[PDB]
């Protein structure tokens, strides 16, 4: 598979990490 660059972090892969919730988005 050829992954794409999206310049954001999904909150689905973000658990126990607070910096995620500081900077996370979704579809």
């Amino acid at each position, epitope marked *: 598979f050829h*992954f794409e*660059v999206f310049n*954001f972090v999904p909150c689905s892969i973000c658990s*126990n990490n607070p*910096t995620c919730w500081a*900077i996370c988005k979704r579809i």
Partner: antibody
Amino acid sequence: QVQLVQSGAEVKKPGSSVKVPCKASGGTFSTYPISWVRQAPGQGLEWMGRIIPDPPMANIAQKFQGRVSFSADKSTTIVYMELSSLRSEDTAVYFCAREILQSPPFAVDVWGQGTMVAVSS
Amino acid sequence: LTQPASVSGSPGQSITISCTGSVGGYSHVSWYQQHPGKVPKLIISEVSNRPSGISNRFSGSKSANTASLTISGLQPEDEADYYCGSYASTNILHYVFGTGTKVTVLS
């Protein structure tokens, strides 16, 4: 358990492209993101970007953007990083490591062998 | 993250490496040791948490935006290139690594 396998050093011609591989021996490449760190022989570690298995999303730094492509063969779970439009500055050793973004580690614990990429000239 | 270029020490004493920041709760800073010709190894995590299998001579401290790695009982086997790394709370959550500190036991 989880150990990362990288290929041997590869000398490349200026302007070409190298696709350094990363294999998960004992790993599944389906939960924890796999970060790629670039290091010249004598350099400070420099994070290039990351690829995340749960969602097929790849994050790449702007400096490395435009040339780095995070491909991956789903079968046998082998991820490949291809640095396109090679130049003399690109000469460095490239490491793939398991980034523990989630979970307490909050660091890159398992590193790979490290494939040295040199632009011959 | 910026580190002292080199930190020299006599065998048995305790050296400290600073990691000054220009961010992830300022508790995500970790410490890495890279011996010449080998891959980097995680030595200290979560400011001071020590991964299993690491010697007790390594500790971690956090002041303001400066993280400190203190090696007690400095031995000639301890010397390596030490890097501190933490997330940068950016759009893609950059994991920023430190400049590097070459600890040297020399006396």
